[PDB]
Design a binder for this molecule. Sequence first.
Ligand SMILES: Nc1ncnc2c1ncn2[C@@H]1O[C@H](CSCC[C@H](N)C(=O)O)[C@@H](O)[C@H]1O
Ligand SMILES: Nc1ncnc2c1ncn2[C@@H]1O[C@H](CSCC[C@H](N)C(=O)O)[C@@H](O)[C@H]1O
Lengths: 256, 256
Amino acid sequence: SSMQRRDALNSLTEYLPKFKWKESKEKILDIGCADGSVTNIISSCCPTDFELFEACDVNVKSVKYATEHYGTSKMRFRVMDIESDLPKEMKGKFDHVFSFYTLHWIENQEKAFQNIYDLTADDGECFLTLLAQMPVFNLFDALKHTEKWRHWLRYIKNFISPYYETSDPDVVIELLLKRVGFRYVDVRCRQKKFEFYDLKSFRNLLEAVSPFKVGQELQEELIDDVMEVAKEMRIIDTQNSTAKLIYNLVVIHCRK
Amino acid sequence: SSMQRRDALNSLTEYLPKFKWKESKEKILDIGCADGSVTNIISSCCPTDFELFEACDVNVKSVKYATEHYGTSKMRFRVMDIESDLPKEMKGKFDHVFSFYTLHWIENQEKAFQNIYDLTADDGECFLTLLAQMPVFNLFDALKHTEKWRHWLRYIKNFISPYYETSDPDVVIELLLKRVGFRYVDVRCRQKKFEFYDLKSFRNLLEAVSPFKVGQELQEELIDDVMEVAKEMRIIDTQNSTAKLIYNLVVIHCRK
Ligand SMILES: Nc1ncnc2c1ncn2[C@@H]1O[C@H](CSCC[C@H](N)C(=O)O)[C@@H](O)[C@H]1O
Ligand SMILES: Nc1ncnc2c1ncn2[C@@H]1O[C@H](CSCC[C@H](N)C(=O)O)[C@@H](O)[C@H]1O
């Protein structure tokens, strides 16, 4: 979506100058590729001569879309889970590891970051963006607690960032990257604003990211109520008919 | 209040090890001293032998309270405005300048920071905490836009952080500290959670920080409605009868 695009571009444009680029043909990995659109933006950034670029995700519908639309000779689109053990093949395989807007889904944080360290080759670089505090999380968790929906979304799986309510999350993550054994580590917490100029654009997002898969005949009525609690929470401005999201995106830049 | 205390203590405990301490008797300044309670915490942190420690604020009721309760031989409590020109006396006077939770009031940001640089002595250190994104701001601005209060709080002065809606505010401030001419500058944006276990404690805060001075007979009814929009905004949890604030505090550590 627009937010991920804007944040991916802005995150790169800033940190690209700070990267070490090995002279020899490179081995790169992006984690959570989804559409492949954003990982295509990443591939386009410097090294024209690299051996292989790999891009993995959990969604199977997406990896196929992304392999058929963006997949090439040196752009392999695999299915993999970071919350899971690696094959012996991939330990120390990759020179540069990327992952944007993906690591706030992992139940077991340390396992995923421990993997990331093991994938990164000797004298390699990481670059991962990650959501902490985000209103959308509070907006949906608010609906799950509504008198109407309380009972029929009591046991629903609602995936919220592990860091959406943690103090100094930059420090928490920094220490977890030093335990796992990264030599250099830079974790900054970036406050971001994103605006919606009509409600149909905001609605379009809510529909997309909603963590509540339900009957398509309820899907419409559910977001009707979500758009309503968004008015109550002042995520949308009723008078101007606009929406505004201020959220924290932690960006991580580390070497081993 | 509890938040400022907790954040002041936590900010110090972390950054004190990173400070250079001149061997010769020191000249220290805290800006926005208010009660004097917090600036007393600051004075207590290392140097037992300093020449003079000065602590200024705009509130006259407070400077008197703070001078009579906390004021000593080497603890002078002056009235001063940073949004205003300094006397020739104070340019390059102070070895260490502090200011917590104070610089998000200044209409003219660059003037205030330009002052700060001029007060700091040659080869000196700054340490300033500063609010960016804070729900309380959104909570009161929400009330000011209520159908009931819209008209009679149309022209009311509502002091919200200049950075409560800015992207990468750490970068904005960092660049404004390099323009003004600080040699070393470290600006981090720290996400913080603070919890309230009863509503009376949350109410007690709202009453205190409310930017709407009005008849004492309305003051009660106003916060009654603020506590209500706080339920609508999910700042307070209705079922548990608790309140929770997640906010960004930018902490600045610079030398000239
Ligand atoms: N454990 C896991 N390992 C890898 N990918 C995962 C994962 N859990 C979720 N994902 C996937 O990670 C993706 C995050 S969405 C963002 C993808 C991409 N970084 C971008 O900038 O758009 C989703 O496709 C999600 O399904
Ligand atoms: N332009 C200005 N210059 C100096 N102090 C100012 C100011 N505008 C507001 N203040 C004062 O700055 C104080 C900020 S409140 C926090 C004070 C102290 N740093 C603490 O940690 O508690 C208030 O007393 C406010 O009245």
